[PDB]
Amino acid sequence: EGKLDTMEIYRIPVQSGNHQSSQVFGFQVQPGLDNVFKHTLLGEILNYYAHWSGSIKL
Amino acid sequence: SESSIENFLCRSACVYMGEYHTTNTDTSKLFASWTINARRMVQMRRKLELFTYVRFDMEVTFVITSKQDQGTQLGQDMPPLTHQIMYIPPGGPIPKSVTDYTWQTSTNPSIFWTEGNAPPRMSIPFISIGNAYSNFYDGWSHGVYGYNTLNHMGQIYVRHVNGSSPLPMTSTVRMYFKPKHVKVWVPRPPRLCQYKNASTVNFTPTNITEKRQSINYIPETV
Amino acid sequence: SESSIENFLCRSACVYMGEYHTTNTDTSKLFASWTINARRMVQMRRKLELFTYVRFDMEVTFVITSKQDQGTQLGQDMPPLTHQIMYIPPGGPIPKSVTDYTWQTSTNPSIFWTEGNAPPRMSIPFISIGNAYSNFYDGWSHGVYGYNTLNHMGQIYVRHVNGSSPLPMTSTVRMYFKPKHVKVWVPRPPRLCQYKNASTVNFTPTNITEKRQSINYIPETV
Amino acid sequence: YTSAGNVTCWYQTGIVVPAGTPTSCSIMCFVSACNDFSVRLLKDTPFI
Amino acid sequence: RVRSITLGNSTITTQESANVVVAYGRWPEYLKDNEATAEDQPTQPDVATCRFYTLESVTWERDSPGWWWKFPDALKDMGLFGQNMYYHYLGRAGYTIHVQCNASKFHQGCLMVVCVPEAEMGCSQVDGTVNEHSLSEGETAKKFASTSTNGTNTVQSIVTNAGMGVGVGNLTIFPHQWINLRTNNCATIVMPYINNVPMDNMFRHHNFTLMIIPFVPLDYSSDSSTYVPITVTVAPMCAEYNGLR
Amino acid sequence: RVRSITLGNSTITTQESANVVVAYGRWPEYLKDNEATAEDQPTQPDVATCRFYTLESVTWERDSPGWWWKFPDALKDMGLFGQNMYYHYLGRAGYTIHVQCNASKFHQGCLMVVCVPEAEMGCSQVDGTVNEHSLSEGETAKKFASTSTNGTNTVQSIVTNAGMGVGVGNLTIFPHQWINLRTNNCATIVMPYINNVPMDNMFRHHNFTLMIIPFVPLDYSSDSSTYVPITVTVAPMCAEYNGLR
């Protein structure tokens, strides 16, 4: 919330100091359905088809 | 193999639905008219915006129905109606009324058809002095931005082929459009904006995607 | 040779009979709708319960009739009516009214047809990301018992292709269904119970067979 | 409510800098598809 | 006239004149190499899957309608086979079932032993949904009923319909054996993996169901034992899971 | 200039110009066939043992004496490797340890990374017995001390004696690497199975101990990060257990 129309949506915020057990990020890998992967180049192509399957490179 | 370009685009759709009468007091409600641009059917539009230049043949089928007005007169015994469907190439004359001489010119291809038979159908080659159509144009006509003169593809006119002083009926036409032998070049990113008009690329600013709770949020496993 | 699997199943039957209007005040009585599951036609259901997994193509023919309402208005001279028949694959959008944009999407296969001609017909391949359909499933969806998500096969929508402000008529559709290239696996015993609902295998306890006089009884020889 | 895999990132150490550097730092992410990818049953897109 | 079999650290003894049923003529095997060749990685433990797991014994008396077991969910607490059911997301296996009983020559009775693939059972009340606890108790056998059941969430487990709305005399269409007490008292059924996809989850789907039904009831006389115990021993065969690397 | 390694369903990335230490020149392997040929039956899971298990990160600051981990008992809750520690009575394995850290070019420091076989530690008070909880916390690293400890049941964990009564500068006799922050920030040590019997129990015996000791302490300047995280990733190699059939 708050950063959906800025370039700040694309940056993962690594913070400084000593925090050596905390989590940085996490998400499910579900293209076509999940809002993270929904409007990418792979996501827009997958929403023209009803059944799809493959493997993903991050 | 289902993601091939031909299987992705070679599919039919209704692009225009007009109405036209046998007798009226308006003289523009006596024929049906449609300029053929590929930016006014929202079905095929977004699928074409993934590409910069396209080249195809066009196949058009027509579905035509009629009715008699509920005005006053019953007990009729009418024969089947005849319909004229005229295509104009880019650079041909344009009618102004149904009684015009331009309905009879030897260079506009025309189809005559009577009701009860199979629906009519004609095919069009790639009609361009250029080498491909242009989905996008960054420049001027000569001055309108975005519009060039190489994407002229023609028009369609339909009227009734009655005699003199006819009976009052009103007809409706559906035009079905389908591309064949399609080839595309230079892929583009999709349109993340709702289309505003049918000539430009104008829009309002929209968000990139939808929100969630935090950057760590994953929904619970079932 | 008449007990082969193909001769036992490759046969047509009426599975749905709906009605739909050109103009109404309900907006759900303006189109016809049917979800395509193989557990709601009692013709083919009991013949399929002899097997556990099946695989076939599907062939569908349509028979469509119309009438004019007996409300008030006579003396009409209507042209032949046009009808749109749209199939939705598993995972496509669903309309809500007849004026929806989803009638025009490029990925739902659709058929246009006018009355007086031969009845329309289209064919469907085996549409499953699995390797066979499942007549029986002992487990959960992810939670509904007995139902899995691999038996999705699609839907059928029908409406009139009129223009604007049409004339009042009501139409009826019969859908005829037929399987082709059928292969079956793992035979089961027949169903010795009357079917209760169209989703589960629920029943009431019934007797095994019918009675006779004694264990020695044989009827008299003629 | 997913039945899908997931990816997470954890601080093993923390970031160490010298003097006269900016404070915060950023990670970006790119997604693509590998060579084998299959799609079936062309439909309508639910975006317009 | 005794054969003894060893799998891992398990040993049981059978009669070598026993007769074996392979289910549809198919032995179990691994899915070969290249139906999902690119990124779908399989693996197999092989170590503590091939060993005998002995369930408890059930007591057969004069009035016993039957017993049933869901496979898997009956091996979900059986050591390492129940471990890989938790860690892995997909899997498949075949099985070998031995069924045995101990009786004298002064007892009589007759059992049917059948393995029913995808035994989808119906609820006791007509407009209702079956609960998952009324389908399985794990390692403990459920029981059929000699009369029609009622209440809510119960399975309509009258033994004549076998909970499936079919005639119980027709379950010979499935892989089966008969145990007749004046003859053999042993039965063995080899069961391959049968599904419509190559691998699947093991908590959502019950592959098959083992049922044991007495047609001729047990009877005895003056000072004999009033019961006969039946013993079931399961050996998983050619089990396989998804890769984790 | 990045290499990426996959084991099962795990993937990590290292630098391909990393330098590898094999412990005494010996790769891990299985015990061959016939040292115990008659009835001693071995088996191996191989499936979810070869995959990377990543522990947590520890925080390195200005005043940090060190960290240590007991192997095994640090993988006893790590999924399937902790499962076979329960079901099987005997076992053996080798390991591959990656140690990594993330620092800038404005930090300085120096680490020693060593794997000490049978690190038998002494109690804090002289006439006492060490408790087992003061030896290990499982996955959580213990800590050394920069001064001499006291109390009861504590390990005498002054860092200069390393809890063993030896001089800490002499732990280079063991398999070790140095991590110097103005150079590499990675270390890899391959560790075979080393014992005086071929197999053994895994709850009674600690085979070796991983220790990490800073000789030159970490220092930084004005607005840098005040900490550096260190990350340990363990891959079990050629694990083997007793037979159960």
Take residue F71 and report the two structure tokens written for it: 């192997």
- What CA–CA distance (Å, rounded) separates F245 from A28? 41
DSSP A21: T
Indicate the burial class of E99 (C-beta count within 10 angstroms; 0-12, 13-18, 19 or more).
Answer: buried
B220–D40 CB contact, under 8 Å: no
DSSP F173: G
Main-chain dihedrals φ then ψ at residue E149, nearest 5 degrees: -85, 165
Count of A–B CB contacts within 8 Å? 41
Residue C208: list chain E partners with CB under 8 A: 160, 167-169
Take residue C200 and report the two structure tokens written for it: 């589960």
In 3D, which of B76, B50, B78 has the Cα closest to residue B191? B50
Q: Classify strands E53-60 and F3-7 as parallel, antiparallel or unpaired.
A: unpaired
DSSP string, B115-173: TTSPPPEEEE----SSSSEES---SB----BT--TT----EEEEEE---SS---EEEEE
CB F69 within 8 A of CB F208: no
Residue D35: list chain E partners with CB under 8 A: 38
- Minimum Cα–Cα distance from C106: chain A residue: A48
F243–E8 CB contact, under 8 Å: yes
- What CA–CA distance (Å, rounded) separates E116 from E200? 18
In 3D, which of D12, C154, F71 has the Cα closest to residue A18? D12
Residue with tokens 């693996």: E43
Residue B167: list chain C partners with CB under 8 A: 77
- What CA–CA distance (Å, rounded) separates A9 from B124? 48
Residue type, D2: T
Q: CA of A5 to nearest chain F CA: how many angstroms apart?
A: 31
Q: Classify strands E91-101 and F20-22 as parallel, antiparallel or unpaired.
A: unpaired
In 3D, which of F44, F86, F69, F88 has the Cα closest to residue F239? F44
**Residues sharing a CB contact under 8 Å with residue B163, sequence separation 6 or more, in sequence order:** none
Residue E87: list chain F partners with CB under 8 A: 48, 79-80, 83
- What CA–CA distance (Å, rounded) separates B132 from E156? 70
- What CA–CA distance (Å, rounded) separates B41 from C175? 31
- What CA–CA distance (Å, rounded) separates F72 from F53? 13
- What CA–CA distance (Å, rounded) separates F180 from F173? 19
Main-chain dihedrals φ then ψ at residue C102, nearest 5 degrees: -70, -10
**Residues sharing a CB contact under 8 Å with residue B135, sequence separation 6 or more, in sequence order:** B38, B48, B49, B51, B52, B53, B54
Residue C88: list chain D partners with CB under 8 A: 43
A53–C107 CB contact, under 8 Å: no
Indicate the burial class of B26 (C-beta count within 10 angstroms; 0-12, 13-18, 19 or more).
Answer: exposed
- What CA–CA distance (Å, rounded) separates C7 from C23? 44
Question: Is it the case that chain F and chain B have 3 or more CB pairs lying under 8 Å apart?
Answer: no
In 3D, which of E115, E106, E103, E114 has the Cα closest to residue E184? E103
CB E100 within 8 A of CB E231: yes
Residues 152-171 in B contacting C (C-alpha not used; CB under 8 Å): 167, 169, 171
- What CA–CA distance (Å, rounded) separates C117 from C82? 11
CB E93 within 8 A of CB E238: yes
B72's enclosing H/E stretch is none
Resolution to 1 decimal place, in Å: 2.6
- What CA–CA distance (Å, rounded) separates D19 from F108? 12
Beta bridge pairs of residue B181:
none
In 3D, which of F5, F111, F16, F125 has the Cα closest to residue F58? F111
Quick one: how many helices (H) and strands (E) in chain B?
Answer: 2, 9
CB C67 within 8 A of CB C81: no
Of C145, C189, C201, which has the smallest distance from its Cβ to E171's Cβ? C189
E47–F50 CB contact, under 8 Å: no
DSSP C119: P
CB C198 within 8 A of CB C35: no
Residue D33: list chain A partners with CB under 8 A: 42, 54-57
Residues 95-154 in E contacting C (C-alpha not used; CB under 8 Å): 117-123, 126-130, 132, 148
Integer angstrom CA distances of residue A1 from A14, A27, A28, B216? 18, 16, 19, 14
CB D44 within 8 A of CB C108: yes
Report CA torsion sign: B115, B117, B119, B121: negative
- What CA–CA distance (Å, rounded) separates C171 from E16? 73
Q: Classify strands E20-22 and E186-191 as parallel, antiparallel or unpaired.
A: parallel
Q: Chain E contact for F131, CB < 8 A? A: no
Q: Classify strands F228-242 and E42-43 as parallel, antiparallel or unpaired.
A: unpaired
**Residues sharing a CB contact under 8 Å with residue C222, sequence separation 6 or more, in sequence order:** none
CB D2 within 8 A of CB A11: no
- Minimum Cα–Cα distance from B44: chain D residue: D44
Q: How many residues are recorded in chain B?
A: 222
In 3D, which of B15, B20, B91, B92 has the Cα closest to residue B58? B15
Most D-contacting residue of F182, F216, F221 (CB-CB within 10 A), to test interface: F221
Of B2, B195, B222, which has the smallest distance from its Cβ to D42's Cβ? B2
C114–B76 CB contact, under 8 Å: no
Of C75, C106, C142, which has the smallest distance from its Cβ to B68's Cβ? C75
Residue D18: list chain A partners with CB under 8 A: none
CB B9 within 8 A of CB B43: no
Q: How many CB atoms lie within 10 A of CB D1?
A: 10
CB E55 within 8 A of CB E233: yes
Main-chain dihedrals φ then ψ at residue E86, nearest 5 degrees: -85, -45
Q: Which residues of C165-192 are buried (b: 16+ CB within 10 A; e: fewer)?
A: ebbebbbebebbbbbeebebebebbebb
- What CA–CA distance (Å, rounded) separates C153 from C142? 19
Take residue B52 and report the two structure tokens written for it: 């910069």
Integer angstrom CA distances of residue E85 from B115, E48, E77, E188, E202? 68, 13, 9, 25, 7
Residue type, F167: G
CB E101 within 8 A of CB E177: no
Q: Chain D contact for B208, CB < 8 A? A: no
Beta bridge pairs of residue C134:
C53
In 3D, which of C49, C48, C45, C41 has the Cα closest to residue C14? C41
- What CA–CA distance (Å, rounded) separates C35 from C90? 11
Residue F59: list chain D partners with CB under 8 A: 13-14
DSSP F221: -
Take residue C82 and report the two structure tokens written for it: 């046009």
> In chain F, what are the helix, strand and coil shares in percent, each to the nearest 5?
5, 40, 55
- What CA–CA distance (Å, rounded) separates E155 from E143? 10
- What CA–CA distance (Å, rounded) separates C148 from C140? 7
Q: How many CB atoms lie within 10 A of CB B8?
A: 17
- Minimum Cα–Cα distance from A48: chain C residue: C107
- Minimum Cα–Cα distance from C101: chain D residue: D48
CB E223 within 8 A of CB E19: no
CB E232 within 8 A of CB E99: yes
- What CA–CA distance (Å, rounded) separates E121 from B4? 45
Residue E46: list chain F partners with CB under 8 A: 43, 45
**Residues sharing a CB contact under 8 Å with residue F38, sequence separation 6 or more, in sequence order:** none
A51–C91 CB contact, under 8 Å: yes
- What CA–CA distance (Å, rounded) separates D26 from D24? 7
For chain B, report the end-to-end CA distance as a whole number of angstroms: 34
Residues C137, C143, C144: CA angle, nearest 5 degrees: 45
Is the bond into E45 cis (omega within 30 degrees of 0)? no
Take residue A32 and report the two structure tokens written for it: 């076509």
In 3D, which of B43, B5, B45, B36 has the Cα closest to residue B136? B45
Q: Chain E contact for F38, CB < 8 A? A: no
Q: How many CB atoms lie within 10 A of CB F168?
A: 19
- What CA–CA distance (Å, rounded) separates C15 from C43? 8
Question: Is it the case that chain D and chain F have 3 or more CB pairs lying under 8 Å apart?
Answer: yes
Please report, to the nearest 10 degrees, the dihedral formed by the alpha carbons of residues F197, F198, F203, F208 taken in order. 80
Q: Chain E contact for F87, CB < 8 A? A: yes
- What CA–CA distance (Å, rounded) separates C128 from C132? 7
Residue C5's SS3 state is: helix
The half-sphere exposure of E223 on its side-chain side, counting CA atoms within 13 A, is 0
DSSP F155: B
Q: Classify strands E91-101 and E228-242 as parallel, antiparallel or unpaired.
A: antiparallel
In 3D, which of F92, F78, F77, F46 has the Cα closest to residue F202? F92
CB A50 within 8 A of CB C92: yes
DSSP string, A31-50: TTTSTTTTTSHHHHHHTTEE
In 3D, which of F160, F206, F177 has the Cα closest to residue F114? F177
Residue F6's SS3 state is: strand
E47–F43 CB contact, under 8 Å: yes
- What CA–CA distance (Å, rounded) separates F76 from F199? 18
CB E114 within 8 A of CB E176: yes
- What CA–CA distance (Å, rounded) separates C167 from C71? 12
Q: Contacts for E160-164 with beta carbons within 8 Å, 24 or more apart?
A: E160/C205, E160/C208, E161/C192, E161/C193, E161/C203, E161/C205, E161/C206, E162/E116, E162/E211, E162/E213, E163/E119, E163/E121, E163/E122, E164/C201, E164/E116, E164/E119, E164/E120, E164/E121, E164/E122
Residue B216: list chain A partners with CB under 8 A: 23, 25-26
Task: Specify the experimental method.
Answer: cryo-EM
Beta-sheet strand order (sheet of F176-180): F142-143, F67-71, F208-219, F108-117, F176-180
Report CA torsion sign: B27, B31, B36, B37: positive
Integer angstrom CA distances of residue C160 from B15, B69, B175, D34? 16, 19, 15, 45
Take residue B179 and report the two structure tokens written for it: 């591309």
Q: How many CB atoms lie within 10 A of CB B161?
A: 14
- Minimum Cα–Cα distance from E38: chain D residue: D36
- What CA–CA distance (Å, rounded) separates F189 from F177? 8
Beta bridge pairs of residue F230:
F58, F101
Residues 14-33 in E contacting F (C-alpha not used; CB under 8 Å): none
Q: How many CB atoms lie within 10 A of CB C3?
A: 6
Residue B65's SS3 state is: strand
- What CA–CA distance (Å, rounded) separates C15 from C126? 19
- What CA–CA distance (Å, rounded) separates D37 from A55? 7
Q: CA of F67 to nearest chain D CA: how many angstroms apart?
A: 14
Of F56, F223, F226, which has the smallest distance from its Cβ to A18's Cβ? F226
In 3D, which of C60, C47, C59, C37 has the Cα closest to residue C133? C37
Q: Chain C contact for D44, CB < 8 A? A: yes
Beta bridge pairs of residue E216:
E110
Beta bridge pairs of residue B42:
none
Q: Please give, one letter per residue, the 3-state secondary structure of chain E.
A: CCEEEEECCEEEEECCCCCEEECCCCCCCCCCCCCCCCCCCEECCCCCCCCCEEEEEEEECCCCCCEEEEECCCCCCCCHHHHHHHHCCCEEEEEEEEEEECCCCCCEEEEEEEEEECCCCCECCCCCCCCCCCCCECCECEECECCCCCCCCCECCECCCCCCCCCHHHHHHCCEEEEECCCCCEEEEEECCCCCCCCECCCCECCEEEEEEEEEEEECCCCCCCCEEEEEEEEEEEEEEECCC
